[PDB]
């Protein structure tokens, strides 16, 4: 269902805009990870 | 049948200890090289990654995937994607497989080649089936998953040769020896006190007659009688590695006579 | 009482939270159990 | 990280012998040399592959995320 960001610890898929600072829900981890892409990557098997 | 002559000693699904005789060292070698580098095979040569929360990197995993030996019995009934007239890959030139794994249990979940699943149409040719030789039908250990981690990949096997990448090699090693009794004097034994006492006598010294003390050097003897042993990796029956070795070498020279021709 | 300045703490010294941490306490904390710690951050 | 799939030098498949090797040691109380020979690793190039590997993944799996 989409997710622009993740949380450094609770893994809970966050996702907010501006003026939202940087915190998760209950896990005030001011960290947050950017979440992978859907544009699947191809790899040489070499 | 007049000419090169095979004389098998051991034989199994993995090795083929034999004795080539009545041939040029050059031919024993070219054949020896061909088996190592130019026998066609199928192998994963493209991995699309949907999900990898594993502890490894995509290219890291992908690299291993390619090293996983795949069924290449009817490899000739498959074409090189570069020759094929499709756009990229198709059933006429490629085998598609899938890998989906999830860390369900709390105990470490292992991912093996057996967990690979063919998704394309093999059209009746024995090809792409991940080789398995272990005593538990598991295959190669591709990765390990902790509870919660996931791995969703999509591979694409293609025909190739060792010259392009060692993953496409059907051979594992190739023992090769001649003149076990240093009679042609091709090598000069290094020693501290005694050549003979310091150098281990080889297997094949039994299959030959030790030179006699007073015989003058035989200067016209050439090199025939080569003791080989081929170890297959599984993607192909041992007997085949050899046979097709001779085959490809044969087609090679053929491609040349045909060059002078249409020249 | 009175607050007076801040003192940077050497990892794994009596003051640090890792000094008394078990192996698993270290993993959950994302700190390699192989780390020695005679430094500051 | 994990058992290399093959012997760097010859190509021998080795990534399918790690667990067996581990058992040959624990549950059978054998020695590494005797253990390795029973798995078929006869030439030292292949022997070193297994005898020298370090399974650091079993430590990576211990981190939560
Ligand atoms: Zn949080
Ligand atoms: Zn095609
Ligand atoms: Zn080896």
Swiss-Prot record, chain A:
Among its keywords, does the record have Iron-sulfur? no
State where the protein is found: Nucleus, Nucleolus; Peroxisome
Which BP terms in the Gene Ontology apply to this protein?
nucleolar large rRNA transcription by RNA polymerase I; ribosome biogenesis; RNA-templated transcription; termination of RNA polymerase I transcription; termination of RNA polymerase III transcription; transcription by RNA polymerase I; transcription by RNA polymerase II; transcription by RNA polymerase III
Q: Which GO terms describe its molecular function?
A: DNA binding; DNA-directed RNA polymerase activity; zinc ion binding
Key words, A-Z:
DNA-directed RNA polymerase, Metal-binding, Nucleus, Peroxisome, Ribosome biogenesis, Transcription, Zinc, Zinc-finger
Q: Does the keyword Metal-binding apply?
A: yes
PTM per Swiss-Prot/TrEMBL: The N-terminus is blocked.
Q: Which GO terms describe its cellular component?
A: cytoplasm; nucleolus; nucleoplasm; nucleus; peroxisome; RNA polymerase I complex; RNA polymerase II, core complex; RNA polymerase III complex
Name the positions where Zn(2+) binds.
7, 10, 24, 27
Zinc finger motifs (C4-type), residue ranges: 7-27
Q: Which domain of life is it from?
A: Eukaryota
Family membership noted in the UniProt record? Belongs to the archaeal Rpo12/eukaryotic RPC10 RNA polymerase subunit family.
Q: What else is known?
A: Present with 907 molecules/cell in log phase SD medium.
Report what the protein is called.
Answer: DNA-directed RNA polymerases I, II, and III subunit RPABC4
**Phylogenetic classification of the source organism:** Eukaryota, Fungi, Dikarya, Ascomycota, Saccharomycotina
Q: Which residues of the full protein are shown?
A: 25 to 70 of 70
Swiss-Prot record, chain B:
Q: Where in the cell is it found?
A: Nucleus
- Altering residue 28 to D: what's the impact? In mutant RPB3-1
Pull one GO CC term from this UniProt entry.
nucleoplasm
Please tell me whether the keyword Acetylation is annotated for this protein: yes
Main location per UniProt?
A: nucleus
Gene Ontology BP, a term: transcription elongation by RNA polymerase II
Tell me the leader sequence span. Answer: none
- For the ligand (Zn(2+)), the binding residues are 84, 86, 90, 93
GO molecular function list: DNA binding; DNA-directed RNA polymerase activity; metal ion binding; protein dimerization activity
- Keywords in alphabetical order: Acetylation, DNA-directed RNA polymerase, Metal-binding, Nucleus, Transcription, Zinc
Which family does the record assign? Belongs to the archaeal Rpo3/eukaryotic RPB3 RNA polymerase subunit family.
Q: What else is known?
A: Present with 10000 molecules/cell in log phase SD medium.
Q: What does this protein do?
A: DNA-dependent RNA polymerase catalyzes the transcription of DNA into RNA using the four ribonucleoside triphosphates as substrates. Component of RNA polymerase II which synthesizes mRNA precursors and many functional non-coding RNAs. Pol II is the central component of the basal RNA polymerase II transcription machinery. It is composed of mobile elements that move relative to each other. RPB3 is part of the core element with the central large cleft and the clamp element that moves to open and close the cleft. Seems to be involved in transcription termination.
Q: How does it assemble?
A: Component of the RNA polymerase II (Pol II) complex consisting of 12 subunits.
- List the protein's name: DNA-directed RNA polymerase II subunit RPB3
Gene name tied to this protein = RPB3
Which residues of the whole protein does the chain here span?
A: 3 to 265 of 318
Swiss-Prot record, chain C:
The residues that cross the membrane are none
Where is this protein found?
Nucleus
Give the record's subunit note. Answer: Component of the RNA polymerase II (Pol II) complex consisting of 12 subunits.
Q: What does this protein do?
A: DNA-dependent RNA polymerase catalyzes the transcription of DNA into RNA using the four ribonucleoside triphosphates as substrates. Second largest component of RNA polymerases II which synthesizes mRNA precursors and many functional non-coding RNAs. Proposed to contribute to the polymerase catalytic activity and forms the polymerase active center together with the largest subunit. Pol II is the central component of the basal RNA polymerase II transcription machinery.
Q: What else is known?
A: The binding of ribonucleoside triphosphate to the RNA polymerase II transcribing complex probably involves a two-step mechanism. The initial binding seems to occur at the entry (E) site and involves a magnesium ion coordinated by three conserved aspartate residues of the two largest RNA Pol II subunits. Present with 18700 molecules/cell in log phase SD medium.
Question: What's the family?
Answer: Belongs to the RNA polymerase beta chain family.
Q: What is this protein called?
A: DNA-directed RNA polymerase II subunit RPB2
Q: Which organism is it from?
A: Saccharomyces cerevisiae (strain ATCC 204508 / S288c) (Baker's yeast)
Residues represented out of the complete protein: 164 to 204 of 1224
Swiss-Prot record, chain D:
Localisation per UniProt entry: Nucleus, Nucleolus
- Miscellaneous field: Present with 5300 molecules/cell in log phase SD medium.
Q: Which NCBIfam families match?
A: PRK04016.1
Instruction: State whether it acts alone or in a complex, and with which partners, per the record.
Output: Component of the RNA polymerase I (Pol I), RNA polymerase II (Pol II) and RNA polymerase III (Pol III) complexes. Component of the RNA polymerase I (Pol I) complex consisting of 14 subunits: RPA135, RPA190, RPC40, RPA14, RPB5, RPO26, RPA43, RPB8, RPA12, RPB10, RPC19, RPC10, RPA49 and RPA34. The complex is composed of a horseshoe-shaped core containing ten subunits (RPA135, RPA190, RPB5, RPO26, RPB8, RPB10, RPC10, RPA12, RPC19 and RPC40) where RPA135 and RPA190 form the DNA-binding cleft.
Entry's Gene Ontology BP terms: nucleolar large rRNA transcription by RNA polymerase I; ribosome biogenesis; RNA-templated transcription; termination of RNA polymerase I transcription; termination of RNA polymerase III transcription; transcription by RNA polymerase I; transcription by RNA polymerase II; transcription by RNA polymerase III
Designated name of the protein: DNA-directed RNA polymerases I, II, and III subunit RPABC5
The source organism is Saccharomyces cerevisiae (strain ATCC 204508 / S288c)
Cross-link Glycyl lysine isopeptide (Lys-Gly) (interchain with G-Cter in ubiquitin) placement: 59
């Amino acid at each position: 269902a989409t997710l622009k960001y993740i949380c450094a610890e609770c893994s809970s898929k966050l996702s907010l805009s501006r003026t939202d600072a940087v915190r998760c829900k209950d896990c005030g981890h001011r960290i947050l990870l950017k979440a992978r892409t859907k544009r699947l990557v191809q790899f040489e098997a070499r | 049948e007049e000419g090169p002559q095979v004389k098998i000693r051991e034989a199994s699904k993995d090795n083929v200890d034999f004795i080539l005789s009545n041939v040029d060292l050059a031919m024993a070698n070219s054949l020896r090289r061909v088996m190592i580098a130019e026998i066609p095979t199928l192998a994963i040569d493209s991995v699309e990654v949907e999900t990898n929360t594993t502890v490894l990197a995509d290219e890291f995993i992908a690299h291993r995937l390619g090293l996983i030996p795949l069924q290449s019995m009817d490899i000739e009934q498959l074409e090189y994607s570069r020759d094929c007239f499709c756009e990229d890959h198709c059933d006429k030139c490629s085998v598609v497989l899938t890998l989906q794994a999830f860390g369900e249990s709390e105990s470490t979940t292992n991912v093996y080649s057996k967990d690979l699943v063919i998704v394309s149409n093999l059209m009746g040719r024995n090809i792409g089936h991940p080789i398995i030789q272990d005593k538990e039908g598991n295959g190669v250990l591709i990765c390990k998953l902790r509870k919660g981690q996931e791995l969703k990949l999509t591979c694409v096997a293609k025909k190739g040769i060792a010259k392009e990448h060692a993953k496409w090699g059907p051979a594992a090693a190739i023992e090769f020896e001649y003149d076990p009794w240093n009679k042609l004097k091709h090598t000069d034994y290094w020693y501290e006190q005694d050549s003979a006492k310091e150098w281990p006598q080889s297997k094949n010294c039994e299959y030959e007659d030790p030179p006699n003390e007073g015989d003058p050097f035989d200067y016209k003897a050439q090199a025939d009688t080569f003791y080989m042993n081929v170890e297959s990796v599984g993607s192909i029956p041992v007997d085949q590695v050899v046979v097709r070795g001779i085959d490809t070498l044969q087609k090679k020279v053929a491609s040349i006579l045909l060059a002078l021709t249409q020249m | 009482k009175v607050f007076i300045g801040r003192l940077p703490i050497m990892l794994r010294s009596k003051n640090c939270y890792l000094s008394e941490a078990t192996e698993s306490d270290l993993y959950k904390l994302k700190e390699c159990p192989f780390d020695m710690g005679g430094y500051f951050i | 990280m994990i058992v290399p799939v093959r012997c760097f030098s010859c190509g021998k498949v080795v990534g399918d012998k790690w667990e067996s090797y581990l058992n040959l040691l624990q549950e059978d109380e054998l020695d590494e040399g005797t253990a390795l020979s029973r798995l078929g690793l006869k030439r030292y190039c292949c022997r070193r592959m297994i005898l020298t590997h370090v399974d650091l993944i079993e430590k990576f799996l211990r981190y939560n995320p």
